[PDB]
Amino acid sequence: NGKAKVSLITSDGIKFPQDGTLEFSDVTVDQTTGSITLRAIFPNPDHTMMPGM
Amino acid sequence: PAVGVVTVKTEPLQITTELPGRTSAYRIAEVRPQVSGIILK
Fold first, then answer.
1. Any chain B CB within 8 A of the CB of A29?
2. Separation between Cα atoms, residue A26 and residue A30, nearest integer Å
3. Mind giving me the DSSP string for B1-41?
């Protein structure tokens, strides 16, 4: 009923310490990925996530 | 020697080329700042 709760499981094979919020879906079909993208803002004060993964 | 036969006539056919391509908006322009300066918000 709401948008949007994203989960994570990081390369360790474990889910990130907590989930994250899916912000939206930009409907533009990415030309060379031919792929929609989802930008989900996540809290990362634990200084764990890093820009890009 | 008896056989089912369908006589041939001229049958109009409106089927035509099926050819693809990429899709795009109209309605898909961009946003370019015309004023240099910091991004405030």
1. yes
2. 10
3. -------------------------SS------SS-S----
Strand ranges (E), A1-53: 5-6, 20-21, 26-30, 35-37
Chain B partners within 8 Å of A28 (Cβ): 25, 28
The span from the CA of B16 to the CA of B19, in Å, is 10
Report the residue of A26, A27, A29 to disrupt the B interface, i.e. the one with the largest count of B CBs within 10 Å.
A29
Please indicate whether, in this complex, the C-beta atoms of A31 and B22 are within 8 angstroms of each other. yes
Provide the experimental method for this PDB entry: cryo-EM
- Comparing alpha-carbon positions, the chain B residue that sits nearest to A31 is B22
Residue A17 DSSP SS3: coil
Look at the block and give the residue holding tokens 């056989």.
B3
